[PDB]
Amino acid sequence: MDSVCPQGKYIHPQNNSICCTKCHKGTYLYNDCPGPGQDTDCRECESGSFTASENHLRHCLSCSKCRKEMGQVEISSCTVDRDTVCGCRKNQYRHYWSENLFQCFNCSLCLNGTVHLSCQEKQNTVCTCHAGFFLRENEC
Amino acid sequence: VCPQGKYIHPQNNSICCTKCHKGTYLYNDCPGPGQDTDCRECESGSFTASENHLRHCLSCSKCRKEMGQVEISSCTVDRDTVCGCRKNQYRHYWSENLFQCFNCSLCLNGTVHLSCQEKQNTVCTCHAGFFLRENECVSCSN
Numbered sequence: 112m113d114s115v116c117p118q119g120k121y122i123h124p125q126n127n128s129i130c131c132t133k134c135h136k137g138t139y140l141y142n143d144c145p146g147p148g149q150d151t152d153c154r155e156c157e158s159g160s161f162t163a164s165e166n167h168l169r170h171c172l173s174c175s176k177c178r179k180e181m182g183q184v185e186i187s188s189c190t191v192d193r194d195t196v197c198g199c200r201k202n203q204y205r206h207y208w209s210e211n212l213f214q215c216f217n218c219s220l221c222l223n224g225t226v227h228l229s230c231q232e233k234q235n236t237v238c239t240c241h242a243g244f245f246l247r248e249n250e251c
Numbered sequence: 252v253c254p255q256g257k258y259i260h261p262q263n264n265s266i267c268c269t270k271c272h273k274g275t276y277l278y279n280d281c282p283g284p285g286q287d288t289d290c291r292e293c294e295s296g297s298f299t300a301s302e303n304h305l306r307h308c309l310s311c312s313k314c315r316k317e318m319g320q321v322e323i324s325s326c327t328v329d330r331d332t333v334c335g336c337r338k339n340q341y342r343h344y345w346s347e348n349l350f351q352c353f354n355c356s357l358c359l360n361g362t363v364h365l366s367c368q369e370k371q372n373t374v375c376t377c378h379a380g381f382f383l384r385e386n387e388c389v390s391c392s393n
Contacts, residue, residue, distance in 0.1 A: 112327070112328075117275075117291075117292060118272065118274040118275050118292040118293075118328060118329070119271065119272030119273075119274060119275045119290055119292075132269060132272070132287055132288070132290075133272060134256065135255065135256030135269070135270060135272070135302050136256075136302070137255040137256060138254075138255050138256050144287065147287075148282075148286060148287050149285060149286060149287055150269050150281065150285055150286060150287045150288070151269075151287075153255075153256055153269070154254075155254060155255040155256075156255075165272050165273070165302070191255060192255070227364075227374065227383075228374065237364065237365060237374055239364075239376065239377070239383060246364065246376055
């Protein structure tokens with residue numbers, strides 16, 4: 112839908128009558144396009160930085176660290192077009208306190224019960240207790 | 252291999268052109284190096300959801316009514332139709348992209364250990380004498 116510049120373009124900062132094509136993820140804006148039909152000069156991000164979406168940033172962003180205070184571990188290294196992917200160690204599930212904040216917790220075992228649902232990436236083990244004992248929080 | 256964000260020109264291997272952005276398709280390759288690629292916005296009812304060099308836009312998808320799916324977001328030039336399920340129905344994925352909507356179980360003779368989620372049925376906790384077989388609490392013994 113409607114924009115000043117065509118889809119995929121931005122307005123030249125030095126000239127409002129010219130629209131330049133944006134940079135793709137993995138690259139940053141090295142120089143604005145020199146005119147309407149010219150290409151924007153986009154260069155690939157240096158190792159240790161990235162741009163995860165189409166953009167016209169004059170710098171790439173530094174790759175993020177996983178939050179050690181949250182028990183996080185890097186599960187996927189940062190590439191020019193994608194930031195560090197963080198997760199938890201095996202047998203641990205992520206508990207999201209918010210959309211972007213999660214803490215790693217140890218998957219529960221089923222003492223006096225039996226695993227109804229195995230521990231998932233973002234969900235603790237779901238236990239169903241044996242005859243006699245009852246479910247109470249994380250323990251039967 | 253052309254630089255990040257570029258694709259090899261079809262008529263000239265010496266030339267690498269900048270890819271088109273989501274929401275646009277390739278109308279004309281770049282005339283030469285340093286020249287813009289001619290990419291144009293998709294017509295209403297079509298989209299391209301990522302960087303590309305596709306010479307056509309793709310037709311917007313229709314949510315699967317047979318699967319109980321409902322449209323939770325309309326198709327735009329840069330994003331296809333987003334489908335989901337009505338409140339109290341969860342998604343059961345048959346495959347990577349195909350999902351079907353199913354009623355969220357009410358825990359009969361059990362207790363809602365876990366309430367129904369977008370991609371997970373209600374989890375039940377049966378009662379004395381009743382053991383859960385499937386998503387339900389059946390009479391004991393077997």
